[PDB]
Every structure is written in C-alpha cells, then in structure tokens.
Design an enzyme around this catalytic site. Structure first.
Site, PDB file in Angstrom:
ATOM      1  N   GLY A  76       1.178   1.045  -5.185  1.00  0.00           N
ATOM      2  CA  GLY A  76       0.103   0.050  -5.076  1.00  0.00           C
ATOM      3  C   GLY A  76      -1.060   0.331  -4.139  1.00  0.00           C
ATOM      4  CE1 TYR A 134      -3.063  -3.233   0.923  1.00  0.00           C
ATOM      5  CE2 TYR A 134      -4.301  -1.521  -0.216  1.00  0.00           C
ATOM      6  CZ  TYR A 134      -4.173  -2.832   0.206  1.00  0.00           C
ATOM      7  OH  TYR A 134      -5.152  -3.756  -0.077  1.00  0.00           O
ATOM      8  CG  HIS A 137      -2.324   8.075   3.330  1.00  0.00           C
ATOM      9  ND1 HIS A 137      -1.566   8.178   2.179  1.00  0.00           N
ATOM     10  CD2 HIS A 137      -2.568   9.345   3.733  1.00  0.00           C
ATOM     11  CE1 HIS A 137      -1.364   9.455   1.901  1.00  0.00           C
ATOM     12  NE2 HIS A 137      -1.963  10.184   2.825  1.00  0.00           N
ATOM     13  CG  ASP A 138      -2.974   3.745  -0.334  1.00  0.00           C
ATOM     14  OD1 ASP A 138      -2.274   4.788  -0.282  1.00  0.00           O
ATOM     15  OD2 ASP A 138      -2.462   2.612  -0.485  1.00  0.00           O
ATOM     16  CE1 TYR A 167      -1.332  19.393   4.076  1.00  0.00           C
ATOM     17  CE2 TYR A 167      -2.413  18.050   2.372  1.00  0.00           C
ATOM     18  CZ  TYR A 167      -1.384  18.236   3.309  1.00  0.00           C
ATOM     19  OH  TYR A 167      -0.403  17.292   3.493  1.00  0.00           O
ATOM     20  N   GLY A 177       2.987   4.032  -1.314  1.00  0.00           N
ATOM     21  CA  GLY A 177       3.440   4.502  -2.620  1.00  0.00           C
ATOM     22  C   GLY A 177       2.497   4.102  -3.732  1.00  0.00           C
ATOM     23  CG  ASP A 227      -1.610  14.150   3.253  1.00  0.00           C
ATOM     24  OD1 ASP A 227      -2.008  13.051   2.794  1.00  0.00           O
ATOM     25  OD2 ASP A 227      -1.194  15.060   2.515  1.00  0.00           O
ATOM     26  CE1 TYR A 240      -4.142  11.758   0.763  1.00  0.00           C
ATOM     27  CE2 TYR A 240      -3.032  11.153  -1.277  1.00  0.00           C
ATOM     28  CZ  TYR A 240      -3.048  11.857  -0.098  1.00  0.00           C
ATOM     29  OH  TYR A 240      -1.954  12.652   0.203  1.00  0.00           O
TER      30      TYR A 240
HETATM   31 CA   LIG Z   1      -0.992   3.510  -2.886  1.00  0.00          CA
END
Ligand SMILES: [Ca+2]
Lengths: 119, 7
Positions: free
Chosen positions: A31, A27, A47-48, A67, A29, A93, A51
């Site tokens: 992927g 996860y 986090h992914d 932001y 970066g 973030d 988003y």
């Molecule tokens: Ca990712």
C-alpha cells in the site's frame, strides 16, 4: 533493488525477519495511501514517496535498479560508483533501513485491512 | 530478488 533493500534491513535490524516489514500499516509493502498508523508506517511512507521521486529520473526503476552499497560493522554506506538513479534509490533504501531500526514495532499494526483502514 | 514486496 528489493533484494538489496531486504539485505539492508537484515544488516540494521538482525533481530527481526524482513517479512515483518513487508506488510505493515498503510505504507510498508504493497500500500501507499491514507493516514500512516505509527512511526514505523511513517518510515515506509517517506520511503514510498522517495521511490516516486526517483521514478522521475529517466529509466529509473527503484524495485529493479541494482546499486552499489556496503554494510559492515554496524554501518550502511552507499558507494561513490552509483549513477544518479542508483544513488537516489540507494539513499531512499538506506534512510528507510535506518528509520526501521529506531522505530517501535507494534504487532497490532501488522497485516491490517488496507481497504477499510487506509482511506 | 525472489519475493513479493517490502517497499
Ligand atoms: Ca508501499
């Protein structure tokens, strides 16, 4: 935006370079698939997903949205002058940068074979 | 920014 997320990590984890987190597990970066390999990977998975949620807001682009935030004296804050897009992205973030700081880093999980291992 | 991807 990614530059700001970069800087959040430098603030909460000054002990390691930002590139360490840019290609880790399934996860962190590029992927977003498969079984998260450890606690740090789980930070990135949350986090992914965060988003993807923020992307539901009209014209909201998490990698590019600038932001308003602060990082001083060990404290990371998203400021009051953020609109709904900026506020959501800043929060994604911030929670990840906090997650990274408390998670063990396993060198073995850096730059793994995503095609073979993240199905 | 000036990079690839961290997120
Ligand atoms: Ca990712």
């Amino acid at each position: 935006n990614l530059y700001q997320f970069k800087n959040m990590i430098q603030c909460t984890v000054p002990s390691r370079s930002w590139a360490d987190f840019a290609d880790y597990g399934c996860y962190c970066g590029k992927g977003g698939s498969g079984t998260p390999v450890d606690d740090l990977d789980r930070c990135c998975q949350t986090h992914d997903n965060c988003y993807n949620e923020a992307e539901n807001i009209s014209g909201c682009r998490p990698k590019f949205k600038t932001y308003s935030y602060e990082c001083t004296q060990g404290t990371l804050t998203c400021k009051g002058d953020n609109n709904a897009c900026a506020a959501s992205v800043c929060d994604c973030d911030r929670l990840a940068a906090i997650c990274f700081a408390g998670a063990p880093y396993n060198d073995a999980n850096y730059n793994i074979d995503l095609k073979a291992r993240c199905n | 920014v000036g990079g690839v991807v961290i997120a």
